[PDB]
Amino acid sequence: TVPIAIIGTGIAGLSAAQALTAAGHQVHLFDKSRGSGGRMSSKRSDAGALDMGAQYFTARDRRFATAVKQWQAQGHVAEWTPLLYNFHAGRLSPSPDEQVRWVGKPGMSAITRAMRGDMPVSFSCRITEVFRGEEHWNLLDAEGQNHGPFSHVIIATPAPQASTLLAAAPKLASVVAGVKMDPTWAVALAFETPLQTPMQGCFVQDSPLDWLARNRSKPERDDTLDTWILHATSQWSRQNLDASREQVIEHLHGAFAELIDCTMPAPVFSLAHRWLYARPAGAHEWGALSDADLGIYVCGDWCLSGRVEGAWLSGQEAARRLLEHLQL
Amino acid sequence: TVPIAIIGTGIAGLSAAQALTAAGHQVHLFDKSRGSGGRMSSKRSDAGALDMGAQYFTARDRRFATAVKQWQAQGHVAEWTPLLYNFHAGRLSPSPDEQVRWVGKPGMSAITRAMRGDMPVSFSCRITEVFRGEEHWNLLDAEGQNHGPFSHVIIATPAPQASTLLAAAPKLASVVAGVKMDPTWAVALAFETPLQTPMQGCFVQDSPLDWLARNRSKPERDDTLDTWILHATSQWSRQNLDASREQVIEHLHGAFAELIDCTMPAPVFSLAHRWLYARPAGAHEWGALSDADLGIYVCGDWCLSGRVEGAWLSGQEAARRLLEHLQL
Ligand SMILES: Cc1cc2nc3c(=O)[nH]c(=O)nc-3n(C[C@H](O)[C@H](O)[C@H](O)COP(=O)(O)OP(=O)(O)OC[C@H]3O[C@@H](n4cnc5c(N)ncnc54)[C@H](O)[C@@H]3O)c2cc1C
Ligand SMILES: Cc1cc2nc3c(=O)[nH]c(=O)nc-3n(C[C@H](O)[C@H](O)[C@H](O)COP(=O)(O)OP(=O)(O)OC[C@H]3O[C@@H](n4cnc5c(N)ncnc54)[C@H](O)[C@@H]3O)c2cc1C
C-alpha cells in the first residue's frame, strides 16, 4: 500500500500521524535526527533527563486539552506547579498560578515518544528533495537514497527548513520562506549543592536571560543533582549566535549568578545548546498550509501560536485537510 | 583576514570566486558533491568522460566571450561541429552551420576544474544553515559541524536549494523560493559498434526525446566506444520524474531507435541521471540577487538566461556587488 509521508517527528507531524492513523490511513514518518521529539526533546545527562527545549505547556483548546487529558491518564504527562518568580531589578515572585502548566512525565520527550509509539519511522534521514510524477510522491535524502512511492506528503518542520522541501510548489514555498524564526541559546548547570532558594522558575527582563527553570522540581525528575536550565533572550541569542558553547556557558551562568541573592557553587557540569529556529518571531493564523490538489501539506507551531498546542493543532489541521480532500 | 564564503562550485560560483580572488580577497568554496562543476560536470564511464549535463555553449556577451577565448588558449575549451538534424516531419537534416558552439576540452568539466585551481575548497560538505553573528557569517553542514568565520556569503546554487540557505534574509528567500526549475532526464548509451548514421546531434519533437549528441564527435573525446547522450524533453521528464533508471533508459532508448534509419546494437552500457533542477523554467533579468549590508549574495544561471553564459555572468555580477560594497 502507498502510505502518506510525514517529514518531521516533532509534535506537529506526530499529531498529523495520529489523526491520519485514527482515521485508518497509513503513514511513514521521517526525521533527520537519531530520534523523535524535535523541539520537545529531552537530554539525558549526569543529572537524568534535562528539558532544554520546550519548558512546559498550556492548553487553551478543548480538543488539545482532551489529548492532554489522555496523555495524563497514560502517565506521559503531569502538572508542573513550580514556585515561579519574576525579575524587575529584583526577584519578586509573580504567581500567575491560576495558570496550569504541563510537562512530560519522566521528561518532556515522553509525550512525543508515546505519540510515536509504533508508527513506521525512518531516523537519521535528512530529506532533501520532494517531487512527484503523475503517480506518486518521492523523497530523496542527503545520501541520494530514494524513498517512496507516497500518496501525499506532510512537511512538519520549522518554516526555513520546510522551504527546500517545497520546490514542487513555488508559490507555497514563497509564503513559507517569509516566516521568521528566532533562535535561543540554552545552557544547563548542575550543582552538587541545592541552591538555597525556594525558586523553581523565573521570568526575566533586563537580562541576557529570558527564562530559567529548576529542572529537578518537575514531577518525576531525578532528584540527585540540582539542575537549572537557562534560556537566553532572542536578541542576546541573535547577538551571540556565533559564540562558543563555553562562552555562552560563561555569560548565561554569569547572568544567573548575578540575579539570585544566594551563593552559587562550582557546577558539577554545564551544557550548552543553540536552537537556531527555536520559536516563530511572530504569531500566525494559518493553522496549516496546503496545495491539496498537488498533494503536499505543511504544518507546525509557526502556523499558529508557536507553542506546543499550536504545533499539535497544526498537525490535526493538515491531516483534517488531507482526509477532507480524499473525496477527491 | 576572514575569508568570503561561496556555496556551490558550479560555473556561477567559481566565476564569482575568480573575480574576488583576482582582486585579492580570500574565498572558501563549499560543495555537497565530491567534485566541482555542478551541471557542467562530466561523468566518468567505460567510454571515457561523458557530458551528461551541459552539452555545448555559445558566447553572446562580450566579456563572457573574452573569457572563453582565454580558456581556449589555455587548452580547456575547443569548438565543436555537430552535424545537426531534426525529428519533426521524419528526421530531416536541419542545421545552424551558424551559431558557433563551445565545449570543454577533455570533457565539459575541464572548464570549472581549471577555474577552481588550488582554491581552498571543502567537498562532500552540504551546507544546511547560514547564519550571522554580530560581525561574522557562519555555516552549518549536514554533519552539524560549524564553518567560519566568514566575512560574507555567496550562495551559488539552483534557486530551490538556496531558499533554505537564505533564512537570515527572508525577503531574498521569498524571491528565490518563487523560482521554478525544470527537470531533465539524461541517458547515456555506449555502442560497441558505431551507429550507421553520419550525424552527431539532433533536435526533437513529438517524442519524449529532445536532444542527442554523439559524444565522440566532440574534440578530444575517447574513440573506442560510440557513446550517445540523450536528453529528454522537460515536459516528459516531469511526467516521468518518479520513474526508475531502468524505465527511463528503456523509453529514451526506445524513442532513439524509433527515429534513426539504421541498425542499433544493444548498448555495451547505459546510464541514466535525473537532473531535478536542470534549467530555470523562464528567463530572468536580475543578474544577481542580494542584500549587501547583510553581506549575503545570491547568483546562478537562473538569475539570467539559464545557460552557461548567464551562470558565468551572474557569477561576475555577484562579485561585482560585494566588491563595490567594500566601499564600507
Ligand atoms: C528552547 C525552546 C524553548 C521553548 N519553550 C516552550 C515553552 O516553554 N512552551 C511551549 O509551549 N513551547 C515552547 N517552545 C516551542 C515548542 O518546542 C515548539 O513550538 C514545538 O515543539 C514545535 O513542534 P513542531 O512539530 O512544529 O517542530 P519540531 O518538533 O521542532 O520539528 C520536527 C522535526 O523536523 C525535523 N526536520 C527538519 N528538517 C528536516 C528534514 N529536511 N528532513 C527530515 N526531518 C527534518 C527536525 O529534525 C525535527 O525533529 C520552545 C522551543 C524552544 C526551541
Ligand atoms: C541536462 C542539462 C543540459 C544543459 N545543456 C546546456 C547547454 O547545452 N548549453 C548551455 O549553455 N547550458 C546548458 N545547461 C545549463 C547549464 O548547465 C547551467 O545553466 C549551469 O551549469 C548552471 O551553473 P551554476 O553554477 O549556476 O549552478 P550549478 O552548476 O547547477 O550548481 C553549482 C553547485 O551548487 C552545489 N550545491 C547545491 N546545493 C548545495 C548545498 N546546499 N551545499 C553545498 N553545495 C551545494 C551543487 O552541488 C553544484 O555543484 C544544461 C543544464 C542541464 C542540467
From Swiss-Prot, chains A, B:
Signal peptide: none annotated. It catalyses: 1,2-dihydro-beta-NAD + O2 + H(+) = H2O2 + NAD(+); 1,2-dihydro-beta-NADP + O2 + H(+) = H2O2 + NADP(+); 1,6-dihydro-beta-NADP + O2 + H(+) = H2O2 + NADP(+); 1,6-dihydro-beta-NAD + O2 + H(+) = H2O2 + NAD(+). Substrate binds at residues 56-60, 95-97, 184, 307. Its cofactor is FAD. It holds the Pfam family NAD_binding_8. Its EC number is 1.6.3.5. One of its GO terms (molecular function) is NAD binding. FAD binds at residues 12, 31-32, 39, 55-56, 127, 301, 308. The keyword NAD applies. The keyword NAD applies. Gene3D superfamilies: 3.90.660.10, FAD/NAD(P)-binding domain. Keywords: FAD, Flavoprotein, NAD, NADP, Nucleotide-binding, Oxidoreductase. HAMAP family: Bact_renalase (MF_02074). Catalyzes the oxidation of the 1,2-dihydro- and 1,6-dihydro- isomeric forms of beta-NAD(P) back to beta-NAD(P)+. Has a preference for 1,2-dihydro-beta-NAD as substrate. May serve to protect primary metabolism dehydrogenases from inhibition by the 1,2-dihydro- and 1,6-dihydro-beta-NAD(P) isomers. Belongs to the bacterial renalase family. This is Renalase.
